[PDB]
Each structure stands twice: as C-alpha cells, then as structure tokens.
Amino acid sequence: TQFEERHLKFLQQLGKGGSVEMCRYDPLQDNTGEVVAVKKLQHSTEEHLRDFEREIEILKSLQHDNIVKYKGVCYSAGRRNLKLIMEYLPYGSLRDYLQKHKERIDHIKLLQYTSQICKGMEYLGTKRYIHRDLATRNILVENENRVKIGDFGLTKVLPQDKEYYKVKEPGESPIFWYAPESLTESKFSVASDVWSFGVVLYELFTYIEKSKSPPAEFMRMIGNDKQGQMIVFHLIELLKNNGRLPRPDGCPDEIYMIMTECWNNNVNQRPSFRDLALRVDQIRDNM
C-alpha cells in the first residue's frame, strides 16, 4: 500500500544519524491517522540515494520480532528522493531509555534485552547481512519487554564467495565498537558484529553512564592527548596487546565472561550468535 507525501503530517523530530521524524499519516485529514516514523536523507546526493535504496531493500527483506517493521516508501516527483516509513516505537532509543531508568532496570531485564538483540542479529546473519554499527544508539524500545534493532544504514551484504566485506573508502566509522581487523584491514564479517555485540553488552551493564562509555574508557587507556588518526593507531596497538574495556561495576561474572569471549583477537574463536542466544537464555532461566 502507498503513502502520499501530502498526507504525512510532521509532529516531532526524533533524532539525527539522515534524520528520523515522527509523523501522522493522515489521509482522512482529521488527525486520526497512524503515527509512523519517517527516515529521510539530510544530503540526498546520487551516491547516498543509491546507498539508501539498498538500505530500504535490506529492511524490507527482514521480518523478525526484534527488527523494526518496514511500512513503505514515499516517492517524490522528478529527482526521486525517498522517505522510508517505519513503525513508530514509542519508548524511543534504548540509549535514552536506559539513561532515564538507570538501575530501576534490573539484570534480568537487561538480559531479556540482550537475548533479543542476539536473536535479531542471528536472523540478520542467516540473510548474510553484516550490520557494522551494532550499538545501543541503534536499538529502539517498543515497550518494557521488547527492544528492536532499528537502523541499518551501514549494513552490507556479503559477496557470494566471501565471508567478509572489505570497505574501500570508509565514511562514518564507530571505531570504539570495531573489531581489530575492521580497524586494520577494513574487514567486516559476522565475527566483527559479534565483537561489536560484546561492546553493546558492556553498554547495557554500565547503564550507558557517560564517563564509562567505550569512547571515554578507550581514550583513557590510550591517553586523552591522542587526536584524529592517532586515536586509530593507538587503539589498534592497545587491542593487539589485550587492552580491553573494564568489567562494569556490579556486572555478574558469567556476563562479563561473554563480553571478553566476544573480544577475541582471533576471529575464528569468537562465539556465534546462535550460541550466544542459548547461553544468555540459560543465564536468565538460572536467575
């Protein structure tokens, strides 16, 4: 079913990454239409538009309880700019949600969120997609009991004959979530996503405390005097030498062990998302 641009009523800006807005799709013009989330490009050039259409095809191919729902696309006349229409997830970003309710979210709830992120990622892998940007900033909360992976802007499809994707000219790079091989060789795979997942687990159990964030902690370890390209250089050498993020205060042993397993320099030794979801669900059952 189609979405007429004239009937999308702006309500509120939700966030920037392009941008995401809260809109009411109101063709009856009586303010009773559905509230949706709309993603559009800030700078809709020819290369970005091509990348955005691929992102849209990726999201449309995905149907999982822990992946934000695709609703449709809005086309503009002439130049062919695109708006991606998604379900509105009313509790917002996990990052803000956890910052707002801090420790009032207990470990068993955090593990319910962990399990769901794991399941969404495992599914993504069966499609041979690499997310590349797994972080709490890309997770949304539908309700108290359900989170969803909510943005796929950096997602690549693996080539048929390879188990990695090599990025030739990197743009946006969340280096503090990157596996060593991604920093050194710009190589991305299911194993690099698992590394990133360990960082997500660190994020949840620090309750996204500002001074404990991955950027804060890694900068401390390499020295706050490191700048620009030198950060990447020193980060690589630190990770090669087993410098890791510390255990979050109050974090259960069995969860901290999962993080450190994800952060294995040896790509082949990192666990699979299938094995992670089983392990996490066993922890929850024990508790």
Ligand X SMILES: C[C@H](Nc1cc(-c2c(N)nn3cccnc23)ncn1)c1ccc(F)cc1
92 binds ligand X (CB under 6 A): yes
Contact with ligand X (CB under 6 A): which of 11, 17, 44, 48?
17
Q: Decide: helix, strand or coil at residue 27.
A: coil
Nearer to ligand X, 17 or 252 (CB): 17
Contact with ligand X (CB under 6 A): which of 58, 59, 68, 276?
68
The alpha carbon dihedral of 129, 265, 280, 252 has a sign of: negative
138 binds ligand X (CB under 6 A): yes
Q: In the Cβ-directed half-sphere of 95, how many Cα atoms lie within 13 Å? A: 13
Strand stretches in the chain, DSSP E = 8-16, 19-25, 34-40, 70-75, 82-87, 129-130, 139-143, 146-149, 156-157, 165-166, 187-188
Nearer to ligand X, 112 or 136 (CB): 136
> Which one of 50-58, 86-94, 255-263, 267-275 is the stretch in contact with ligand X (CB under 6 A)?
86-94
Q: Which residues are annotated as a binding site for ATP?
A: 14-20, 39
Is 62 within 8 Å of 121 (Cβ atoms)? no
Backbone angles phi, psi at 76, to 5 degrees: -105, 145
Measure the CA–CA gap between 190 and 67, rounded to whole angstroms: 17
154 binds ligand X (CB under 6 A): no
How buried is 86 (Cβ within 10 angstroms: 0-12 exposed, 13-18 middle, 19+ buried)?
Answer: buried
Nearer to ligand X, 17 or 72 (CB): 17
Q: Is 133 a catalytic residue?
A: yes
> Which one of 10-18, 51-59, 219-227, 274-282 is the stretch in contact with ligand X (CB under 6 A)?
10-18
72 binds ligand X (CB under 6 A): no
Contact with ligand X (CB under 6 A): which of 140, 199, 208, 258?
140
Contact with ligand X (CB under 6 A): which of 55, 133, 151, 217?
151
Q: Which of 30, 65, 106, 133 is catalytic?
A: 133
The percent helix, strand, coil of the chain (3-state, each to 5) is 45, 20, 35
> Which one of 106-114, 133-141, 157-165, 213-221 is the stretch in contact with ligand X (CB under 6 A)?
133-141
Token digits of residue 196:
């990133």
Write out the catalytic residue numbers: 133
Interacting residue ranges for ligand X, rule: CB under 6 A = 14-17, 20, 37, 68, 86, 88-89, 92-93, 138-140, 150-151
